[model samples]
Target chain A: MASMERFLSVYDEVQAFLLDQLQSKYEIDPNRARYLRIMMDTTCLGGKYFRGMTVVNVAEGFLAVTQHDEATKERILHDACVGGWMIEFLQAHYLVEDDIMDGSVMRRGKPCWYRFPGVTTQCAINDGIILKSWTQIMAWHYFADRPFLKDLLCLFQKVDYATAVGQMYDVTSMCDSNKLDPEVAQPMTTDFAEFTPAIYKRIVKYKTTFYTYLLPLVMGLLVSEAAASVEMNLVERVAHLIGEYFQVQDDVMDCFTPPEQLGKVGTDIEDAKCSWLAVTFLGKANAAQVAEFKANYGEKDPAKVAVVKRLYSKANLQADFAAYEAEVVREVESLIEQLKVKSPTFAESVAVVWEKTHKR
Target chain B: MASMERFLSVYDEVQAFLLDQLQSKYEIDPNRARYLRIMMDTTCLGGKYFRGMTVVNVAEGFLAVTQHDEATKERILHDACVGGWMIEFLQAHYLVEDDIMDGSVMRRGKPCWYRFPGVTTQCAINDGIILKSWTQIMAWHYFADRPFLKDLLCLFQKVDYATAVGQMYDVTSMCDSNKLDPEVAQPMTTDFAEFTPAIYKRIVKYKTTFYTYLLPLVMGLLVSEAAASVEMNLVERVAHLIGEYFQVQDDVMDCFTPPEQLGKVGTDIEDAKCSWLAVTFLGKANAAQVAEFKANYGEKDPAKVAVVKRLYSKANLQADFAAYEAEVVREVESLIEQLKVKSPTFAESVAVVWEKTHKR
Candidate 1:
């Protein structure tokens, strides 16, 4: 099956699994089940679903290239498709919580789940946790008897820990600020100024990339025939670089995308987010320009968004991004070359994301 | 070491493991680590440790009886102690969220973690998840190689699913009204008078008892030399009955205990909780008394609290509780007798909780 077709089919499969289990096995009331359905719909299906599609792409390649019989391939494909849906569900769970923490009012094309018609952050918060809890429920149901189940469960545990800490830093904006009713604000220190390109890249790798890039890549290799099929270190290292690349693209989009077109107003600057541009913008600006940028940043003022945009214009970040994008692609290419010996298809899977992310 | 020492020592062991991993392995900052530490202190260590101690107490019986040598017993005692701590940490995690959802102000004679001096529900919400995530980090660290690891992991996954759904029902208080910002409250088609004694007992079984009663009992049996040592049905049955018994006592104490003695004022009637007393009180009251209760319940007025207490007094609920508690104990005692053949100590372990809860 084609990748998008497979992705949607996988999405259908798990949502049924989720809704059915919730209503039947759980015998939850129609109301709770209704929320789960609506949340999952807005949650994973409405998005680009690139993270989930990777599971299909990478796992399909690994299974098709290696497996001899179509039936065995069918078996693993069903498993991989469910696995693919899992990454989407995982992201769906995180994004619901992310919007609440980021205080973002809009997402994909609609209001944040926290601000969904009835779901204030109080009940909306439960949706993320319930979604997360139910994701493992799906994973365990589909793969309970598989030999790699423990490893699969552990892998998720590891990634969740990594993702949560990334959220800690992100929620703080690498500052002393607690998101909810902090008694004091963090001083933007010289130490704070050290949030550099290198720092930003590492943060992106953990915050965005691990679950988005490395997870599916690792799942693909692990599910192929054996866990040994994955050149584990090399796969993560390459996935790590692309995740950093993917995040820079996101940072660029957040600043540069048209609000009307993108479906949400970008607030990274207003929120004092750890955008790659913010780190680089500081390095490029002179004193008065830096003063203007600093004064206009991390506040709810609309004028500040305009001010940061102009600072980016003055810094010629569009040109700088062209150069940065090329470098990230080449670095991924070099790593993909190293990975080619183990599984050329998996390398191609990584390469495709670099192309897809870079093209935009 | 004695069990209490082991429990505290294990408490220190897992909290440090949890804290250190969040900082080092996950690269979280001291700020988040500081929040984690304060949260854990309020969250678990300040309490009875009854839930946590059961892990050690149960495991010691299973291990001492089964393991051929003392050294092996010593080795796994350390593991069981750690596992026991995991269950407490699990309960601690839930307790934080439970307090928030229940709107509890005081827990364990101090403030709720969500309301602890400077903390709010948003950050406190992360603690339970953080503690739960770290609990698995503890489990995987200690049991990665055991033949029973997958089974144990599956066991936790099952409990968490059951518990999350139970939380769903309990937090909604099985009420017609949703909290905070409901676009539509529940249908009220059921009139919520369907919150029968059976429903309250079932909710208590899943919400409180699963964690408080069966979890440690199951953990004890599972941590032994064989996963099959647990007679799953009988154990949860006895545990479920005792869990129901335990919560009735909780419901009774909420109204009966002196404010100074319970370390806080009782607010079950004020919260409109689906308490066992609430279930039975309605059944016993005359229509005039029902009118009186309907007016006064779920309000913060002390006069209302006094009025409802008088109504329960008129209905003879203390006598009602004595009879109900005896019946539950008999049911549990019957189940425990059935379990004596496969796990006499495990049966005794479950029986011990019934006695302790009755003394109050």
Candidate 2:
């Protein structure tokens, strides 16, 4: 935990590096430059840094297995830190756009970037593009000398596009809920017709899993030149299992966790997100209950929010999730056990991520 | 012109290729996939294809100078056309976001993509991202086997970041004019405090020039393997001159040209864009006239729009623009004349673009 805390603090250096690069590369109005600074600070900071932490943890573990010299280990880890931070930078880009798309008001316990006094939706859109652009710049600036730079760039691009497609699934599943009709006070509501495990899993894999879990691990391997040693099929399988496990944990916590602990308000119920709890409830509920669930699912009203919460409680979703978590842990441990024979070091490295999930 | 038409029609093939790749690579719902198809068709189609045409022309011209065989020429030009279409893809990405930022209702005589039924601001944001992502995909799929692939990737990344910074300059210069106060029907007006020639030119160069003129020319050179032979300093200078000239033509047309001829309604006056004409108007207008211009600019009302238009006419901007156009022609011809001495074919190649500008 102490090491992770130290790891998280390195974000400040990354932020400074990016800001300095912005100023050095382009001469612009001071005021405009200031806006870019604020945009970066707002969106990039305040995350748990779990995704980035995974990168560093995996790299350290992989380096330990490979038995690098102390000086070489430190140098490689430094690159891992930057790659890790770039992962966070990519996350920041998505969060800014996600908040706008989700009509989210508060993020990281503050007004969202788009909700800033001078930063409107329009500026926010451009800020999202700017943030994404910086990742590309960083890729070229840092990794151009590395042999795997092409792979790194392709990884980022593919994951980004997948996430966007996932977002499309999310938005379209909800029946254009973001369409704001002037006469109406609230925006549109989510339509539950397309809500299913298959679709929900697609969203999880594409939007959440690929970037959150797989990208960091791949970067760690690529940076350490360890990607060549592992079976890619095995790597993907492990990533998929871990990614699925992590998202369900998130979906479970979104309803159960408090805003203070979660570090952001829960809007899954109100947003009508195709969450795990909602999908589970759909499968269990009878006609009357399903009808009631639909009515109360996406409403902004407190009573409707309460009804959905009550439905989850009545359905015993908390206990169900406990079973699901246990089963996933068993599967992950079993997979890692099998992996231990092939690469004990990589197995333990992945185990570190597995254990961190329980810490939450 | 006939060749350009043939070049323009290749967009369909490019579009088809992208769509096929999307379906083959990802297992997505048909409904969701349908939405993506609509998104691409709406944004990527119906352009003048001038940027793409320039790429093909430059490549053909360079090939002529280099004396390639017909078979070799066809293969290189095929690659050029793909590169040309990708540039349009990049432009489409910007235009979708630009329309949303500018609160535009119409584009190419139809409702803006964001304003389309069942596609709101949220979906539009993701759509913008998806379009940008395809350019990266296209780069990898098309150029991975080529020697200059890294250069091609770097150029796209740098130009994209530069354009985003240009957008930053554009949005911030307008004083967060897109702040959508709920009670008010319209957004905030543009603040002209930073509206200087230097700033406007930055907006023109970074936002308009780099992507529009320099990128296509460079891609052509890169594809033809003629980049090593030409002086990039000269290429950049010519691109800057031509880009600046092209933008001024656009700004002049925004007010002077009719909606029917322009193919979209003019909103530069209401948007208070840091346009060439607006900056020039600021330079020449007297103290009281400046105040009147400030009040009338960026207002959505008909009378105010009329006032800004009348102000431009009374200032004799049309006649001024004619003189400006003549001076630009003399400068362009003189530069090309000088360029002819060094690279006759490249000069005539650029001359083709220059002549097309007059046709508009």
Candidate that scores best on lDDT: 2
Please report the candidate that would top DockQ against the real structure: 2
TM-score of 1: 0.92
Per-model TM-score versus the true fold:
0.92, 0.92
For candidate 2, lDDT tens digit of each residue in A1-360? 244665666666666666777677776544455556667777877767888878888787777568777888776776777788788878988998988888888876788778876677877888888888877777777777988888888888888888888777666556543443222233444456557778678778787778887798888888888886577676767777788878888888888889988778888888778888888888778888898897888888989999999988998887777887888888888878777776787788788887877666
Kindly list the interface RMSD, in angstroms, of each predicted candidate in the order they appear.
4.9, 7.7
> Deviation in angstroms for B123 in model 1?
3.5
Docking class of 2: acceptable
Model 1 over residues A261-338: C-alpha lDDT tens digits? 778988788777779898888767788877887677777778778888888888987777788877876788788888
Off by over 4 Å in 1: A19-27, A174-191, A226-230, B22-24, B29-35, B102-104, B116-122, B177-190, B226-230, B255-266, B299-307
